[PDB]
């Protein structure tokens, strides 16, 4: 053959790639036969509204909604304090905060040390 | 499919393939054409990162 | 930049057409179906659809180029694409 | 042949 | 002051007793005239303060705070008056007092001479904009978010009020001047680390500072467009003004106590920009964005150099304009397509162009481009941080960076790309939005060529 | 709903040519070889069972990702062109010639006399257009995205009007 | 097609060309070869170098402070 | 396999609709109607003089652009920016500050009117 | 060149510091040697504000050339004699560097040379 | 104008790479079929290219012609002075 | 490079305006004649590009290389920089191998 | 006094007078292309003269004319540095954006906004220019940016498509 391709997150298989485009079963062809008819119901529903001459405005859609919702208002409702929620949130949101105090921190106490025995050299710093 | 109950808030919110728009066919007819988004179709949780003006997670040659 | 008529469309899909060592240019006609008419088959027709994307400079997708099975549905698609309506 | 530009209204 | 106050208290009775046609007309004509007369407070001292009487006085601090307020107070009643289109008559007036009661007790809020007075003053800008968000707002979220703006800010505020009256009890007064020039240093204990965390935590909530704000989200994103006007434009600078006054008694605590608080905010405009690139709500955006800037501010107040007064004053100022103007832009097109989400109506410049451009200005000025005077505030604060550590330097430019792309991602979705094909209901901008925009723009400017007038009394 | 063999093997057939085009350039070179893609291609062009058929498929495609080019020609206008989607800036929705101020209109009289002709032919239309869909469409709904013509003389096609009066592409 | 019709285009065949358009290029290529030659004709120092390199293996140790081994 | 004889049907209807709707895209010749407008006398001088374009005219045409758009955005504004440097901006000290010009051997300063000395004869290197 | 792989793929004691060179005395070998001469004095350089690391050994030539490039203009074809011999006063210049080059590897090798004779009998 | 396209029947491989090509694939008992599509790249005022130093070199023999015009022109103004 | 660069960009985009917004150079071929003054330009410009000899990039990049090529520098910098030197004379000529010379592949319609 | 400083600031201003003129009547007509190219070409010809005269004597000068504030001790002035580097680049950016306008009143023809894209140019050019000649850091971050964000809406000129914009 050839050097095979690793598909990846980031850089994923092609259609072209993939063994199960190649073994197809008759459930196979139902299942995408019913995902064409759901399909073509969206499609028509749309296209009537969309060609209607007395229609204004815009055509309300429940799944815009429903995902502006899930991203929104449906978070706490459904959120647990588990150990990974609560690893991650004393992670990211505690972590941070010392991990940057600490760096200013001794930043700061190494000037004012320096500032002490005059070993900073400020010779045209007026302006603070 | 929705996504594993593991307390971060994603309910039934069904997780589909995580994959960007500019892996969605071009020379389909899209009602929005430019999204390559259909009216109705349930929507990536992350279609605002996966927009083509964004992360891509296109196959590459390499 | 020259517009673009039903006219030249015709003549110049005809032209790739009489080009082809498999057409007979004697009996090609407009509306000659390339598998009946001409006893091609789609491989040749597929050839024929890239002839046409080379010829005009634009591409027709496969969806739509396996269903132009005669001269003038090429013709016919191309002032579609096109919006020539002489 | 001149046709006819669909624009917005750029009265306002 | 009174000659300031007295004509905004008559725009009470004015707006009580006009024609119900003449409501908008005789508010705005007499609120920008009132407007015209607060820019005299501008002609102001290299030394001390404009000290009118026992219980006003004006200074280059609150001064640009008032023109602002007074001038925010028309553009307001032109943002309103579609929406309440089909409001009743009383309605309508009462939607106007409260906007009047509003912009009263910040005047009077922005002059007092007393910390005590300055407290009660500053806790009554509560009632009416309460009452703007929860009974004008148009969602039934805009109740909870009513309850969290309400009790955050209180459960900031009432520890301030205890220790404001420990202070008059200890050092005899609350007057501005005498506790300036009768300032003893704060020594290094657990009662004085308490008073100053009373004396910081109200004005450190109104900012908010991150971890502070969830109330900020729900408060500006519910309200009207008016609400959502004041509450970003002069209703954050209180926090941020009251700070500046009530500093000169906490040091040197501020040296140490600051350290929590500036780690807070200089992480919080890292968290808060990173949240603005990836909200689906356009409002949700503007709103995000105003934490930034006011860490920002944060930093500057608690770093309590010239320079970073400077620089803090100067962006409240251009923060102020330009999140009104921003929340006016998405109003425009809330208005048209009855929804706040921000990928619905897309491709808006090959139908809006006038628009577009306004938009291209508000990002602009929201970028902090140079010589803008957003760009100057945070530039000074900016250098300031600088010499306060040079590892500030990380985390502001990444914060500019990130500010960046999402103000232009903001751009790009909402005004550029393909229009939307069944949105067929977006009608031309009218003269009174196009004035608005402009209203918004033309003197954030204008302050470029006087930069002065907005740098506080440290210039 | 899906794509039959014949169909696979035509689209890879046709990517493959067009990758061969730009890995060859010249169009001696490109005959040449693609006379022998052609051979290659007619060498099992009448095989028994498709089981081997696919398995030859699933070969050329693994081939065809090793091989092709990593940047192949595209079209100018095609998608990923360099012309791409450039004239979107330019295509004004037909609805918006409603919101046109009266004295923008009165300098095209004809064009809007004719506007309102074709929205009186779309107005009149299509209630009986709705009506051959319903009459059309088996219970449980449409399970293809096709469209039927119009059928009885005097009737237009059901859902014409945005396919009919789309913006051009070169429209401004 | 429309106004400015001095070029027809040609179908499979090679363009139509202008006297003026030839005589340009002619000129213009002509121009920079000309230039070429009488700038190395001038200035050959600026390809070839001005001076001679020197040898340093060529200096006498006199002329260069080298003393023999017994000083 | 083709186009069915349905989609043969509707594409065929869908093309006559979309013909007629791009004839009726193309402009009558009173189209597009202008309204009224007034003309200046500078440019009334013009469509009685320019009215034939010759030769002469073009040339005179254009020295009238040339003359008009140099002074408008040459002259005017040399004249307001030497105004303002001059009288405004060098009223003040060390605005405009100028680097020395280079002084070399023999030269002669206008100001005192001294003669700058010859540097010392050259050690001779012969090439 | 030739000195950079004598120096790196070889011994580069025997070749010289860039950076260090001269280690040994300019009098060593090197009797009634005479200090360079400088012609143009520092206020000349002044005045014709040479640039720092123009005011070099040749510098006289430079201010000669600048000075007739000020009084040729708007011939700027004129005063090539001038650049001529500012060209060749660098040159001179630049073999006087090479000179020391090959002087402190000569010196070096030899020094290396008389260690060794002197460690071959003891 | 109407654009009169040339009579196909002129179309011809002979003489051309693709009659190389076409005897190539003859050998192997293949047959382009597509060859007269391409045959106007190769013919005409197209029937004829310059190489890379030929076409680097235009204008050169004229340059050359300038500049030794230019050359003998200025030795006679030296034997002026 | 402002003068030879802002040229190359212009004659590039002479040849896209004459092949219909077309912008790949395997679909170029033949304008050596076709586009007399624009190959004579772009010529010229890659020619000035590549450091010929007394035109105007000699002027400066010869002179830069001389510098680097004499200075106190890291090795592998010298190196990169003149394989880069050979590159670009190579890109050079894939522009004109391409667009100008050899015969036409760009669409009949001329 | 010098003309030098006049014509080095005369230079940069009259490449504003078409931004200003962006919204008279010529901004609405087919002339204003040709107008904004024929003020560049002026510009670049007004600039040969501080080239010519540092040419001869190597005239160099800062301008200070409008103080803009003060920090207590840091005085922010409109500063212009005309110097070799501004006064020889400032003619050749100007004749090369000279050709470039008149190529797009060919290459752009057909661009129903060509005024705009235009006018786009100016401002480029104009920040670009302000980039070049400023004595001080605050005036050329002022370039600079304004020079970014030129090049942002440039480069997404056809904002239709989403590969420009991003
Ligand atoms: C020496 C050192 C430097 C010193 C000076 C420094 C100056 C600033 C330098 C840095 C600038 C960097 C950014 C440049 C602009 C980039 C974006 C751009 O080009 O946008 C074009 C765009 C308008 O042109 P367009 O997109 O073709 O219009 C399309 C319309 O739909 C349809 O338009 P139309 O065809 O119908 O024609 C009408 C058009 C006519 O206008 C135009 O066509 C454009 C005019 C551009 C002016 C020059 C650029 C802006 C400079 C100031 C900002 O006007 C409008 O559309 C309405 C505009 C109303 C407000 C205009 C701005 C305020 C007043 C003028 C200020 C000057 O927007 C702007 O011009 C606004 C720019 C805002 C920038 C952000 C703010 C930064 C800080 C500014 C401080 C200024 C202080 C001093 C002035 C104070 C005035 C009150
Ligand atoms: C004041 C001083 C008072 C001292 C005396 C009282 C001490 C005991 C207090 C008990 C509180 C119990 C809270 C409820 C609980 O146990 O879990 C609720 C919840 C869990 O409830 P849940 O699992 O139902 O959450 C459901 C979430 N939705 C709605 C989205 C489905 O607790 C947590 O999530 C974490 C609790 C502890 C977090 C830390 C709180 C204090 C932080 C510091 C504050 C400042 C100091
Ligand atoms: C620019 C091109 C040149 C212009 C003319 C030259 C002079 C010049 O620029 O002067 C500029 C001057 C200052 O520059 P100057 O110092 O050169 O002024 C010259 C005049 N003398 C010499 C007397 C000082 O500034 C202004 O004109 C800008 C005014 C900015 C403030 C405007 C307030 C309007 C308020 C309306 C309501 C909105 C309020 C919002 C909140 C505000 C809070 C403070
Ligand atoms: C209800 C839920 C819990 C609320 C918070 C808890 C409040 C009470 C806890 C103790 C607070 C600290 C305290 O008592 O400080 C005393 C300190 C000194 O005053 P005094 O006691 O007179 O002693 C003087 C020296 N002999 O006092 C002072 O120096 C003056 C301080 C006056 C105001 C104190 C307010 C409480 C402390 C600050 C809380 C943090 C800030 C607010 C945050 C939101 C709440
Ligand atoms: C959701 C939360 C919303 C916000 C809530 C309210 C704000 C956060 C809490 C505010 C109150 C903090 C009180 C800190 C008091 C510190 C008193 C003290 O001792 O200060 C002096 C000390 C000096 O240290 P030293 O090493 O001596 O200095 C060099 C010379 N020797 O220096 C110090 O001690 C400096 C301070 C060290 C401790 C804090 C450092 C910052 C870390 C991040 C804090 C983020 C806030 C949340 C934390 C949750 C846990
Ligand atoms: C730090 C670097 C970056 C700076 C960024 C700045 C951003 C803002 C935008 C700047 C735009 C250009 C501003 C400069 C244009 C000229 C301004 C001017 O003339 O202002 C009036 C000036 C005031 O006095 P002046 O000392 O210059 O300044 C005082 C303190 N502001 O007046 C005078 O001095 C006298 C002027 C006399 C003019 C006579 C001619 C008038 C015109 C012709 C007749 C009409
Ligand atoms: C980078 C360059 C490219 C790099 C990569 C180049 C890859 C080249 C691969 C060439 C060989 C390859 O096996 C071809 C395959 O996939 S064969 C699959 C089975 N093939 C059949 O023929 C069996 C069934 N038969 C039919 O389906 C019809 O007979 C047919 C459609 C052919 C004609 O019928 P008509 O259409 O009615
Ligand atoms: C004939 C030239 C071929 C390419 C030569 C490449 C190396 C040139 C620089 C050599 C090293 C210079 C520094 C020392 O010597």
């Known amino acids: 053959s050839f050097p095979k391709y690793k598909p990846s997150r980031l850089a994923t298989l092609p259609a072209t790639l993939d063994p199960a485009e190649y073994d197809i079963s008759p459930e196979t062809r139902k299942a995408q036969a019913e995902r064409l008819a759901i399909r073509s119901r969206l499609k028509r529903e749309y296209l009537l509204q969309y060609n209607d001459p007395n229609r204004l405005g815009v055509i309300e859609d429940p799944a815009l909604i429903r995902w502006t919702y899930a991203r929104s208002a449906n978070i706490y409702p459904n959120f647990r304090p588990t150990p990974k929620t609560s690893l991650l949130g004393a992670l990211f949101g505690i972590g941070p905060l010392f991990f940057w105090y600490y760096v200013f921190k001794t930043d700061r106490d190494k000037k004012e040390k320096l500032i002490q025995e005059g070993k900073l050299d400020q010779t045209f710093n007026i302006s603070y | 499919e929705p996504y594993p109950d593991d307390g971060m808030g994603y309910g039934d919110y069904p997780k589909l393939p995580d994959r960007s728009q500019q892996e969605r066919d071009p020379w389909y007819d899209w009602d929005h054409p430019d999204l390559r988004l259909n009216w109705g179709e349930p929507i990536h949780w992350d279609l605002d990162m996966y927009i083509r003006n964004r992360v891509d997670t296109s196959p590459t040659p390499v | 930049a020259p517009p673009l008529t039903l006219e030249a469309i015709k003549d110049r899909v005809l032209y790739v057409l009489k080009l082809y060592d498999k057409i007979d240019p004697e009996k090609l006609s407009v509306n000659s179906h390339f598998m009946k008419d001409l006893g091609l088959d789609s491989l040749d027709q597929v050839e024929i659809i890239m002839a046409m994307e080379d010829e005009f400079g634009f591409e027709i997708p496969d969806i739509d180029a396996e269903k132009l099975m005669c001269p003038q549905e090429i013709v016919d698609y191309i002032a579609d694409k096109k919006d020539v309506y002489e | 042949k001149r046709l006819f530009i669909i624009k917005p209204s750029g009265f306002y | 002051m009174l000659k300031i106050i007295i004509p905004t208290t008559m725009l009470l009775p004015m707006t009580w007793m006009s024609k119900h046609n003449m409501i908008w007309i005789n508010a705005t004509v007499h609120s920008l005239l009132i407007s015209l007369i607060s820019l005299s407070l501008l002609n102001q001292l290299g030394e001390n303060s404009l000290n009118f009487s026992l219980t006003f006085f004006s200074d280059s601090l609150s001064a640009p705070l008032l023109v602002l307020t007074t001038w925010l107070l028309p553009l307001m009643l032109m943002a309103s008056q579609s929406h309440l289109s089909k409001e009743t008559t009383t309605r309508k007036k009462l939607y106007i007092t409260m906007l009047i009661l509003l912009q009263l007790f910040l005047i009077m809020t922005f002059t007092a001479t007393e910390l005590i007075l300055f407290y009660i003053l500053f806790e009554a800008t509560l009632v009416p904009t309460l009452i703007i968000i929860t009974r004008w707002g148009n969602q039934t979220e805009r109740l909870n978010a009513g309850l969290y703006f309400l009790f955050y800010t209180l459960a900031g505020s009432l520890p301030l009020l205890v220790a404001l009256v420990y202070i008059q009890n200890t050092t005899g007064s609350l007057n501005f001047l005498i506790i300036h020039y009768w300032s003893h240093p704060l020594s290094n204990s657990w009662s004085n680390i308490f008073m100053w965390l009373a004396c910081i935590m109200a004005f450190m909530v109104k900012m908010p500072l991150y971890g502070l704000h969830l109330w900020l989200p729900k408060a500006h994103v519910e309200a009207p467009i008016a609400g959502s006007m004041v509450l970003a434009a002069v209703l954050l600078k209180l926090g941020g003004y009251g700070m500046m006054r009530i500093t000169t008694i906490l040091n040197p605590l501020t040296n140490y106590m600051a350290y929590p608080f500036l780690m807070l905010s200089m992480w919080g405009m890292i968290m808060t920009s990173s949240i603005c690139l990836r909200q689906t709500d356009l409002k949700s955006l503007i709103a995000y964005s105003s934490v930034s800037h006011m860490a920002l501010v944060i930093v500057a107040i608690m770093i309590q150099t010239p320079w970073s007064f400077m620089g803090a004053t100067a962006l409240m100022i251009a923060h102020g304009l330009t999140s009104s103007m921003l929340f006016c832009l998405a109003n425009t097109n809330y208005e048209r397509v009855h929804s706040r989400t921000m990928i619905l109506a897309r491709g808006l410049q090959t139908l809006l162009p006038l628009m577009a451009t306004w938009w291209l200005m508000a990002s602009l000025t929201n970028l902090a481009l140079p010589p803008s005077i957003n760009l100057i505030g945070e530039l000074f604060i900016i250098t300031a941080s600088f010499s306060w550590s040079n590892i500030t330097i990380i985390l502001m430019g990444m914060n500019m960076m990130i500010t960046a792309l999402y103000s232009l991602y903001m751009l790009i979705t909402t005004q550029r790309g393909k229009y939307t094909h069944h949105i067929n209901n977006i009608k031309a901008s009218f003269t009174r939005e196009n004035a608005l925009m402009a209203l918004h723009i033309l003197p954030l400017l204008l302050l470029t060529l006087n930069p002065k007038m907005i740098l506080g009394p440290l210039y | 709903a899906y794509l039959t063999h014949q169909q696979k093997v035509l689209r890879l057939y046709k990517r493959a040519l067009r990758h061969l085009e730009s890995w060859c350039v010249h169009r001696d070179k490109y005959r040449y070889f693609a006379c022998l893609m052609r051979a290659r291609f007619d060498e099992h062009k009448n095989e028994k069972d498709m089981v081997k058929a696919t398995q030859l498929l699933r070969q050329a495609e693994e081939e065809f990702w090793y091989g092709q080019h990593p940047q192949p020609y595209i079209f100018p206008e095609s998608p990923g062109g360099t012309s791409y989607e450039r004239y979107e800036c330019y295509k004004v929705p037909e609805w918006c010639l409603d919101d046109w101020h009266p004295s923008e209109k009165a300098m095209y009289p004809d064009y809007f006399a004719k506007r309102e002709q074709w929205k009186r032919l779309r107005r009149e239309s299509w209630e009986r257009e709705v009506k051959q869909l319903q009459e059309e469409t088996p219970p449980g709904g449409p399970r293809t995205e096709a469209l039927p013509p119009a059928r009885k003389e005097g009737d237009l096609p059901p859902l014409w009007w945005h396919i009919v009066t789309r913006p051009r592409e070169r429209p401004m | 097609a429309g106004g400015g019709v001095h070029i027809e285009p040609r179908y499979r065949q090679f363009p139509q060309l202008t006297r003026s358009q030839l005589i340009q290029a002619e000129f213009f290529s002509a121009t920079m070869w000309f230039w070429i030659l009488w700038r190395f004709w001038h200035d050959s120092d600026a390809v070839l170098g001005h001076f001679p390199y020197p040898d340093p293996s060529q200096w006498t140790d006199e002329e260069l402070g080298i003393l023999p081994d017994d000083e | ?127 | 060149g030739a000195h950079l792989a004598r120096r790196y793929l070889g011994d580069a004691s025997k070749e010289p510091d860039p950076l260090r060179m001269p280690t040994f005395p300019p009098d060593y070998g090197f009797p009634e040697r005479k200090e360079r001469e400088m012609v143009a004095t520092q206020q000349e350089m002044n005045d014709a504000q040479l640039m720092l690391q123009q005011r070099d050994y040749c510098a006289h030539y430079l201010i000669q050339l600048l000075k007739c490039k000020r009084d040729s203009f708007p011939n700027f074809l004129a005063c090539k004699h001038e650049q001529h011999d500012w060209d060749y006063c660098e040159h001179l210049d630049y073999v006087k560097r090479m000179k020391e080059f090959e002087r402190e590897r000569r010196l070096l090798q030899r020094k290396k040379r008389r260690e060794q004779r002197e460690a071959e009998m003891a | 104008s109407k654009m009169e396209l040339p009579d196909y029947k002129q179309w011809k491989i002979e003489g051309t790479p693709l009659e190389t090509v076409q005897e190539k694939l003859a050998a192997r008992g293949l047959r382009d079929p597509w060859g007269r599509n391409e045959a106007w790249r190769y013919s005409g005022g197209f029937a004829n290219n310059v190489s890379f130093v030929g076409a680097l070199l235009k204008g050169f023999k004229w340059g050359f012609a300038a500049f030794v015009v230019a050359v003998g022109a200025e030795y006679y103004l030296e034997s002026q002075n | 490079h402002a003068f030879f660069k802002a040229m190359l960009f212009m004659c590039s985009g002479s040849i896209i305006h004459s092949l219909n917004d077309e912008q790949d150079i395997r679909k170029m071929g033949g304008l050596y004649k076709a586009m007399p003054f624009t190959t004579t330009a772009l010529i010229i410009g890659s020619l000035a590009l590549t450091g010929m000899p007394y035109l105007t990039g000699f002027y400066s990049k010869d002179l830069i290389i001389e510098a680097v090529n004499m200075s106190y520098t890291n090795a592998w910098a010298l190196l990169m920089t003149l394989i880069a030197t050979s590159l670009t004379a190579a890109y050079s000529t894939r522009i004109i191998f391409f667009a100008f010379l050899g015969k036409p592949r760009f669409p009949p319609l001329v | 006094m010098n003309p030098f400083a006049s014509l080095t600031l005369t230079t940069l201003i009259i490449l504003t007078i078409p931004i200003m003129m962006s919204n008279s009547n010529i901004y609405k007509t087919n002339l204003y292309p040709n107008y904004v190219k024929t003020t560049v070409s002026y510009a670049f010809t007004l600039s040969l003269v501080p080239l010519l005269m540092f040419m001869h004597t190597g005239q160099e000068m800062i301008i200070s004319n409008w103080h803009w504030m003060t920090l207590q001790t840091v005085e922010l002035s409109l500063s212009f540095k005309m110097d070799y580097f501004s006064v020889m680049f400032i003619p050749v950016a100007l004749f090369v954006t000279w050709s470039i306008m008149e190529f797009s009143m060919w290459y752009m023809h057909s661009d129903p906004f060509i005024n705009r894209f235009f006018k786009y140019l100016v401002l480029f050019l104009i920040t670009m220019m302000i980039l070049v000649t400023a004595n001080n850091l605050f005036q050329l971050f002022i370039g600079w940016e304004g020079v970014g964000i030129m090049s942002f809406l440039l480069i997404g000129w056809w904002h239709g498509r989403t590969d420009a914009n991003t």
């Open chain 8, 1 to 127: 396999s083709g186009y069915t004889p349905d989609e043969k049907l509707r594409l065929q209807q869908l093309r006559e609709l979309r013909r007629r709707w791009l004839k009726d895209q193309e402009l009558s010749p009173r189209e597009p109607v202008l309204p009224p407008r007034r003309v200046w006398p500078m440019e009334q001088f013009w469509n009685k003089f320019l009215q034939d374009g010759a030769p002469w005219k073009n040339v005179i045409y254009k020295t009238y652009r040339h003359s008009i758009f140099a002074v408008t955005h040459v002259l005017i504004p040399v004249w307001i920016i030497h105004y303002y440097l001059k009288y405004h901006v060098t009223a003040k000290p060390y605005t405009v500050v100028e680097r020395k010009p280079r002084i070399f051997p023999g030269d002669t300063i206008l100001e005192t009117g001294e003669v700058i000395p010859l540097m010392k004869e050259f050690p001779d290197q012969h090439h």
